[PDB]
């Protein structure tokens, strides 16, 4: 009856992925929701991840209610960091309409390492918290549609 | 009469309310039926719409038209410029994409101000216009028999 | 037998969508083509109108043989503007692309008012007879393929 | 038996589109393979003709192993060049990959005129016969993986 | 064993040849077979994806994950952030819209120092991050059983 939620974390930096995994499940138990966690090696992996989920439960295999997807982006020195943020929350936000899923989108985007954690930790921004929060907000609707 | 949906995606209580309210009253005014759901965010709204439609294709409510609803401010973070380009971009293709008819009143501002001076129906009323786009789209989509 | 398309106008600048009309209406007399034309709100608009088309021609509805999108976008003191030009020219991309249709992209993009009447009027740079000239050239190149 | 390319350009500059039109002529002949060339007046209606192409083919019409895709954006005046550039890019892309075929893109972006010239000249970056061998090059691995 | 496409960009055989090495060493470290094809930018590498895919469909070699290599190095012009942009972009919808696992080792530095940086195995070895990458989304694409 508990929606059954799947976390897709991708993570390069164990301590802040720690903070915004934690951040998610906090606020998943205590909306009392199961859920699984999986991880990849980086955001935009997040997205066919989730796309091979819904191809799994297809074929019998566990039907989440809905996704969480997590992650964290620094724009540092190199160009490949602006790419990852806009097509991570592009793919995301197309397989949210094309599979008319419930995903909450916890990718943050910080400027430095400051923010990273700033927004990581459940205790200040707790940008993971949201992204759960928002992904059961969303499983509510997908649930209030009956889609 | 056209039934709505209306979603809107609500940071500050405040400003969504000037743009309920402008979307409500336009949808009254023209003798349209409506409900209205909520979002955390812009990005959400267009998932939200595919629900509704996918929630129709097994007896649920079908709408003729939808109103998107969301304010977001270019502040310090980047996390507003991405979801406003995505967010535009997401409700355009499900528009082509399932044929239907959507008020884009998701508001790009600059600053606070600039919110409120498109938001409450006194002024600009980007709701407003967003519910009028809505009928407007499901009358040419009448029109053309989609 | 002689081409019809869909003139989807998008008018916020009367006087403006009215130079636009006047250039695509002259380019499409000119060629001996005839057309229909409504109307939207907005740039964004245009996309779903032209979908709808295809839709309703689908059902017996009238069936054109190429579209011109018109719009006036002015790059004003909000950010709510390069948005809906870079969108309404992607979306239009795709749409003639996806549908495999002939589609005149006259939705103009300018710093001010004063551009605005160089480009739209059909005595100036007559970007709305262009447009109309372009979708008849696909129309062209439409009907020599032969899809 | 030889490849049989369509060569799509986008022609606003005459004399560039003529030298990276030999260039590709070029860099075809050599090859052994044909071509037919169509023309469209902007990079944004490339993707489109390509696929009025593909579509005339499922209607007996003539079938093509690869396409070229020419065309001259320089950043100028308008910002209607921008736009050009990336979308018409981003709806190649997509269209090879949507439909699985062979694509040279030759669609130049150069910032002014003198770049114009070394890119579009066969005897200089001969971008032309980089497109047209960046098709046939598709050409030879869509049928090697037998697609 | 996993069997993968390779498919790398290369202009610059250097550093391809870097990419490359580190890819293939990651996978048959991992005891994963692969066939390597060639193309000329980073753009072309989602369709050939795409025709691997094709042929497979037609009794031709099915691949359990691709891995795409290439370097694109922002030089002068703007010509280089819309390759970069459009094949990121490419990549990653293929990988959702055919749900398979796909290893992004497609380069995008600032300068070619960076590239080798980026490019060397003994480095940050992006090209055998790119080939762990796609064994992690083939094991993970097994696990959901897609
Ligand atoms: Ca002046
Ligand atoms: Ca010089
Ligand atoms: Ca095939
Ligand atoms: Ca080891
Ligand atoms: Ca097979």
Same mark, same amino acid.
């Given at each position: 009856? %508990? ?11 164990? =301590?802040?992925? =720690?903070? /915004?995994? @934690?951040?998610? !499940?906090? %606020?998943?138990?205590?909306?009392? %929701? &199961? ?29 989440? =209610?809905? $996704? #969480?997807? /997590?992650?964290? #982006? ?6 490949? $960091?602006?790419? #990852? ?6 793919? /995301? &936000? =197309? ?14 985007? #910080? ?14 921004? @707790? !940008?993971?918290? $949201? ?9 509510? /609707?997908? !649930? !209030?549609?009956?889609?």
């Amino acid at each position: 009856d %508990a929606p059954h939620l799947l976390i897709v974390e991708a993570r390069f930096y164990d =301590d802040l992925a =720690d903070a /915004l995994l @934690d951040g998610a !499940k906090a %606020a998943l138990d205590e909306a009392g %929701a &199961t859920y699984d966690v999986v991880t990849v090696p980086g955001a935009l992996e997040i997205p066919a991840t989730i796309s091979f989920a819904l191809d799994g439960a297809d074929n019998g295999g566990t039907e989440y =209610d809905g $996704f #969480v997807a /997590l992650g964290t #982006v620094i724009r540092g020195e190199t160009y490949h $960091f602006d790419i #990852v943020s806009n097509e991570s929350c592009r793919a /995301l &936000t =197309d397989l949210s309409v094309e599979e008319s899923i419930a995903i909450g989108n916890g990718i943050l985007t #910080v400027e430095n390492e400051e923010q990273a954690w700033v927004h990581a930790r459940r205790e200040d921004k @707790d !940008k993971g918290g $949201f992204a759960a929060r928002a992904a059961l907000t969303m499983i509510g /609707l997908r !649930k !209030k549609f009956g889609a």
